[PDB]
């Protein structure tokens, strides 16, 4: 499908950026996760980035590590994540859904079989955190064969070779990394580097979404003003889940309020 192209076509018509929340699938449990996701969508999420709990998440700070631990405490497995993904797609036919995977979970019992599985459930993209473009060949090839967009990081330390490769290899959107380090809401990412945005556009790369340490509406509007197509927020949202574990009702209301404010900031 072209769920991403259709989304960006529409956002451009409305002259707005995308807002894309991240959550860990199955955090704090399967049923509540499914409700959290519905709430993210109802509140204005343009697309979703969804993490599959992994044992050793090396790109993630404490917030998302603890999300993974909550999901595991609830018995969540990749098999169950694919079960949720089917229910999500069944309710929401148009929203782009991207997975954020660690490499071992993709490689585990066959790279091709993983992407076939994604296509089958109706996922639109996969970003493999620990697969640089240098190692990406069988991943991006399998992705394209199964109509999944492989998504790549354009880091702030990117050179021209990496710009060209990300532009050539990636589909759906380009993940414009706001800063070094691992995920976290309190370590605020810098503004999008203008030179990377321009080069990505010169090389016909997929539209750039800024991610890492994006935690406030001001950062979202600033990313879009800077030329990005939108922004992704993860840890800031997960913190709301963590804060309200004792009250699922208050969890949902706070998620809704935050996503709404974040999405509003993407609007012209």
């Amino acid at each position: 499908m072209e769920r991403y192209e259709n989304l960006f076509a529409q956002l451009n018509d409305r002259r707005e950026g995308a807002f894309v929340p991240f959550v860990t699938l199955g955090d704090p449990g399967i049923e509540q996760s499914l409700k959290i996701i519905d709430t993210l969508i109802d509140a204005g999420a343009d697309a979703l980035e969804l993490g599959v709990p992994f044992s050793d998440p090396l790109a993630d700070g404490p917030t998302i590590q603890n999300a993974n631990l909550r999901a595991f405490a609830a018995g969540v497995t990749p098999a169950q994540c694919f079960e949720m993904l089917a229910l999500i797609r069944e309710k929401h036919p148009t929203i782009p859904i991207g997975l954020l995977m660690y490499a071992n979970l993709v490689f585990n019992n066959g790279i091709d079989a993983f992407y076939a599985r994604c296509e089958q459930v109706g996922v639109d993209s996969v970003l493999v955190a620990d697969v640089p473009v240098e190692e990406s060949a069988p991943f991006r090839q399998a992705a394209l064969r199964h109509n999944i967009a492989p998504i790549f990081i354009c880091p702030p330390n990117a050179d021209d070779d990496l710009l060209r490769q990300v532009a050539s290899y990636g589909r759906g959107y380009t993940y414009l990394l706001s800063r070094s380090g691992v995920t976290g809401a309190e370590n605020r990412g810098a503004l999008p580097l203008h030179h990377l945005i321009e080069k990505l556009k010169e090389y016909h790369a997929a539209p750039a979404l800024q991610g890492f340490g994006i935690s406030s509406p001001e950062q979202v509007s600033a990313a879009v003003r800077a030329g990005a197509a939108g922004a992704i927020s993860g840890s800031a949202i997960v913190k709301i889940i963590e804060k309200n574990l004792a009250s699922p009702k208050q969890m949902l209301a706070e998620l809704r309020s935050f996503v709404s404010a974040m999405k509003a900031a993407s609007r012209a």
Partner: protein, 395 residues
Amino acid sequence: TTLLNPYFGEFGGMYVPQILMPALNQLEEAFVSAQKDPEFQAQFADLLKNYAGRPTALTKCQNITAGTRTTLYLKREDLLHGGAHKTNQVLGQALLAKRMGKSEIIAETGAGQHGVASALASALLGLKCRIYMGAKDVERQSPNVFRMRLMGAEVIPVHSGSATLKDACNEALRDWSGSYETAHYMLGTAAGPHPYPTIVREFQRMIGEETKAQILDKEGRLPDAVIACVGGGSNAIGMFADFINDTSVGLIGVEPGGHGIETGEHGAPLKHGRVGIYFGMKAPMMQTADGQIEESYSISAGLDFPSVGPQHAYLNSIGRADYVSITDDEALEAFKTLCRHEGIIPALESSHALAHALKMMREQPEKEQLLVVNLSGRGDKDIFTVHDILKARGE
């Protein structure tokens, strides 16, 4: 693009987030430049000789082989400054760090020997050192925590996951992904993303080089086999490297069997795990059916790691090296036997290699064999752990 091959057959590579690739390429470039730099080689050589105390002795066992046809030598890395082989490549990596203008060092440690080596190197060479150590290991290898802090290193206990080596590894890598502009990650074994497995081998290969020279001088021939323990793979590849092309010499690596392979509480991914991607490399991993990393177990903190360096996975696949396992109890017996009969207190890690050598001898006592065990460390860090165990037994 790289200057050197990041793979050993199927194994190895550079599976890190894109942010870290320039750091790895920088490090590879500095290593390649340093290797052909006479100044660097002379500085490294001087530190090895006059500071760390190389060459280390090659000791012939006087008693433990009595009544058998095994001649057994111990390569005495326990006599290296710091108390283990880990000191060799730390000195080399520390010089690389300064060459690349890094002012800080991050290191993981489990036995605390790599942490002690990183601390002592950072004290000498003017680097600010922070060490991640699993909280379980902070307790069972406590003497090294004291040594590290005495030398001005920051020791950070890691309570997540199993609170052992892989969790310290995870924290070290997370830290480095944010601090690489000013900090060098002094990885402590021959594993991780390229170029670490190559650099660590090349900065440890003096172990095998000396061993060959020494055994030639004393015996007039090469060993029938060289035997080393394998947690991540540095002391083993350091012993193996100069012998790889001597096809007559058996290369035997010993993974920890823990409470026994059948219990699932071990640290033997090479022979009992399956290939996976984690900690920056494609390598054998202890993993669940659906691809989560399993926690390892060993009595010895230095072997308590659920993966293994890619060159060992490769050497095994082509049949050039053989890998076995040795349990906690077998390691403990070998520890005791060396203390009481050769007057050497070996690291519990090294005791796994010695234990396998003693099996080779005992199983076939009339087989003529000339064996070298890499005695990778001294057991000072282990004496209290071993005492408590032996006492809890009734000995």
